[PDB]
Amino acid sequence: EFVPPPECPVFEPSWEEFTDPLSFIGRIRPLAEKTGICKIRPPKDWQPPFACEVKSFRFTPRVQRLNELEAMTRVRLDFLDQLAKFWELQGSTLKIPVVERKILDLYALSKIVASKGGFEMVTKEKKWSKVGSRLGYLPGKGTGSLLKSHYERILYPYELFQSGVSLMGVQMYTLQSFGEMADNFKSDYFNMPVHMVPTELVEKEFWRLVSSIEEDVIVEYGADISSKDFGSGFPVKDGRRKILPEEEEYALSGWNLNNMPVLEQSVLAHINVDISGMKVPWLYVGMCFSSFCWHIEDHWSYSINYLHWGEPKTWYGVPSHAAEQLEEVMRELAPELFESQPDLLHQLVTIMNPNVLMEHGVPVYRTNQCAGEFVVTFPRAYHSGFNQGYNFAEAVNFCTADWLPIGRQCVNHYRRLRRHCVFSHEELIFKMAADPECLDVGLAAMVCKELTLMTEEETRLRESVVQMGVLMSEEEVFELVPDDERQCSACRTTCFLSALTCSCNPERLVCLYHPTDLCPCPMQKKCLRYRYPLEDLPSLLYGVKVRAQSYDTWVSVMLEDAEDRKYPENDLFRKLR
Amino acid sequence: EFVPPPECPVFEPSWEEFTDPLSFIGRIRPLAEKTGICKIRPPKDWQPPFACEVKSFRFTPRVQRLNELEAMTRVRLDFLDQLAKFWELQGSTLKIPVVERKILDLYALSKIVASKGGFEMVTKEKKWSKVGSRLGYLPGKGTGSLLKSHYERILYPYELFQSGVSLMGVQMYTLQSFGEMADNFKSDYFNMPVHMVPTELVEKEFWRLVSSIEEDVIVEYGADISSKDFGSGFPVKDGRRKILPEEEEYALSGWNLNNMPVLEQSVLAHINVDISGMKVPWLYVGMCFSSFCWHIEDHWSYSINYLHWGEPKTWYGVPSHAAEQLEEVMRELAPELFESQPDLLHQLVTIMNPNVLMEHGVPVYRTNQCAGEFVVTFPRAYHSGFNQGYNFAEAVNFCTADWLPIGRQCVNHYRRLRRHCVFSHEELIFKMAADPECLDVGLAAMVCKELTLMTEEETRLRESVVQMGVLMSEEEVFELVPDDERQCSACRTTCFLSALTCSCNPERLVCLYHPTDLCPCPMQKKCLRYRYPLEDLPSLLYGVKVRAQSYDTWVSVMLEDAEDRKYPENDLFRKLR
Ligand SMILES: CCNC(=O)c1c(O)c2ccncc2[nH]c1=O
Ligand SMILES: CCNC(=O)c1c(O)c2ccncc2[nH]c1=O
Ligand code: NI
Ligand code: NI
Ligand SMILES: [Zn+2]
Ligand SMILES: [Zn+2]
């Protein structure tokens, strides 16, 4: 009944192609970009040893109910649409609180609270903790009394209303033991050896279980795991181990995921600036049927995924150019609701059957990631999938020159939503511009093209605001103040280049894209807090344009300057020797 | 000229004594407690391999100038003594800020700011970053413009005052590469091979350099290094490695500083409650002359230090009974000053030459810690020391049954100062009481003796506050609220068992020892936020008294119930077999 989509392309590089990963990926970009994802096979000779033990590797499992794994169900959508309209009528507006790093499920919450007899029922009986349990929340963190506070503040008024009449007052594991678990589960299911069941079959049964209410099937996985805390499944050198000579090669290989962020073609390279939250790999342990719902990467850009071992990982990709189109069909389900809550679209997890996306005219490709094979995700390429069986993988994100404009275009979208930004994109650009040398010339070139766009756009914003009647201009260093302090009153975006402060608050801020929403105090007295005076234009565009056009001339002791200035080669350097 | 003090004792336990670390210490306590510190030599067969690589191990070095290593110098004291009196006059009070984990040195700061021409001079020249650099503050974290905020708020008014007339407005490295450094330095100094210089000679030369303005000497070290981030110098099992069978021994050893916190006699054992900041060891890399000033561990408990390798580490300890006597003599230096700033005594680092504390009547012992030896610190044992040469060491704190009453006493002191408690001593006690089984019988017996004292004291504080005219009593879970929120207005102590709130502030809190300081709002309406109703007394004292007095009778299938209830042996179990 279910239909496997087309296979995304694979690549099987030579050892010389395999040398510089980000060059090889640049080689591959014009092609793989159209599928949104692609698979890569390192030379069969390349097989890095697994660093981690298993027999002792301890993790707290998370869980999925494949029935309710879909959050976009008609009943959940229509509910929230109604609770929203309720608060609109009330003059308030519905705000969905975040709990345990994920949005609260109100439909689930309201159902459950009511199933046991309602707010004050649950309250007087102190069952609020029993609730959060069934909600997939980790005890004993105190979520129970937090849900009460939330239910009262949001759902109880609607309860009353939705209830009879009323509404007067008030208002305003071990990796080892997990494999045993995982392999026992799969075999008993399919009645075979786990390795012996074909991929097509499990794939077919997976999408069967999602929409099937005739049965319930639960699974355990793990994620939200860091090389930092849990250690990398790769050998690498920091202080903690004498590294074996066997391992020495792989540890220094750019394909070792810990090494990618620092590669000279990486943006998060020579900058020592901030923790973006991924300079460091993330680990996903898996079982059969264990899944990850449709999504993209923070600030878009890339994602590289590597399966260390275990049964294959199943993927579904979509191109970056089909991105808007994708979100458009998902929006057809609750158009009135997604209006009021634009970002709620992303908040809500979905596995939308690929056939449905394809019948709607969206390109959807796929593949089976097998042990020892990479998967690459491109900027704004939507991806999802599941695992064939017990397995282990490691994944980072990253960025390159080509991404810079997309990353800028990415903020504007996050700014147009109300979306917290994991860093300042514009801040990043200057941290690169402030050390032009030892910077990959490709970045330098792109930065010139990207930066002049912002100097224009900023000067427009800077002159736009003096008309509004602000006078004083203070000067502050934004990178040194914490992200949450430098955000904009309603954007919500991390400000670097400039923002606006009036005296209505000691600290509350708004970016120049929303100057009027700072506070009712007339423009009147000040204050534009800026970063650079406009003396910046000659200064910083110089150093980057230098190395940008130092390379432009150098191509048109010459083989020396390349080594001194750290130019790339391939190509040209071949003509030399 | 310098005189070596008496040596603290060493202990060379048998392999059978060496099997349980915390038992063997209690064996020793009545003796070593009187010296305040002791050295411990494991069986020579015991040689755990060093888990950490060196050639790549990266640490950011801190630095020490032994001349100014002394913060209690006369000139600095009188300066601070005056600056306080200045502000007393102004109606304000002198509040010494903390900057990057430690108190700001105002005397140094002012001296420097004044040497370059003072506040507005430095400001208009933007040299505030040059300042913090010479104050040692790590760039580029923004400390420079932070000091400017501080100087103006404190020193500038005094600057004007202390300046002519005025004062109108306003107001209100690699371990490898480090080994090379330390060895070269140590050898070029004494003109010998580094291992060839006697211990007694360096000791003499060290204390010479402290009081010597005749010459300047700078030294590098590292510290504030966690096993968490950097990894432990011990083998151990979590997920980061498969452990060699050679290492399997030492990984599980109770003498592995990773295991100590979890040992059955530890308090930080079976409770899974809160990060104490030490369940985890810490690392100190060291050099010739690198030092650590007099101090007691937080909450007055223990520190067990294992020197992994390199040249020896020199210690100076003091008994816990001489502690109050110790602080007294350092207080004689600026009694007027320390009155206004009681805790400034601890804040200020001092190396006071042992010969002085001895001639002031303070017991002062010592010893030479050699690679592969342990150093144990007893509760409220003041200790300082320096390193003989290049080495590596690892340490953790820990708590035992005998410490509990001292921990309680410590809070009472931290409360009588204004001192931030790293955790709530009372909360700890109840988390243990809440799991009586599988809890070491000695703890249980102690707990009941400790807890009953608290039920009395609390009920005294509980009945005391109703006379004050508070009525309503709410009930809150304090452990689930963050520490800094549950502190006291002025105590400043983490409140758990109870505290007092009113409506003047939505959240601002005061410990029941200080109900009057909450606000001017008359007692009037409420609000006592308590934890347990007084239904606690029968309940919790039971479960602990159960296992406490279950063992009392058991000593007075019998060898079974000891295995079931996890009783200890030594002793009695020997009569069994
Ligand atoms: C069942 C464990 N989870 C996963 O395997 C998992 C991924 O493989 C993944 C790949 C790419 N981007 C995001 C992802 N998120 C995930 O959770
Ligand atoms: C020069 C390297 N530093 C140290 O060796 C060092 C200690 O041994 C130490 C022991 C106990 N309590 C605090 C300590 N602090 C320290 O810094
Ligand atoms: Ni992803
Ligand atoms: Ni100490
Ligand atoms: Zn904005
Ligand atoms: Zn205003």
Ligand SMILES: [Zn+2]
């Ligand atoms: Zn009040």
Ligand SMILES: [Zn+2]
């Ligand atoms: Zn208090």
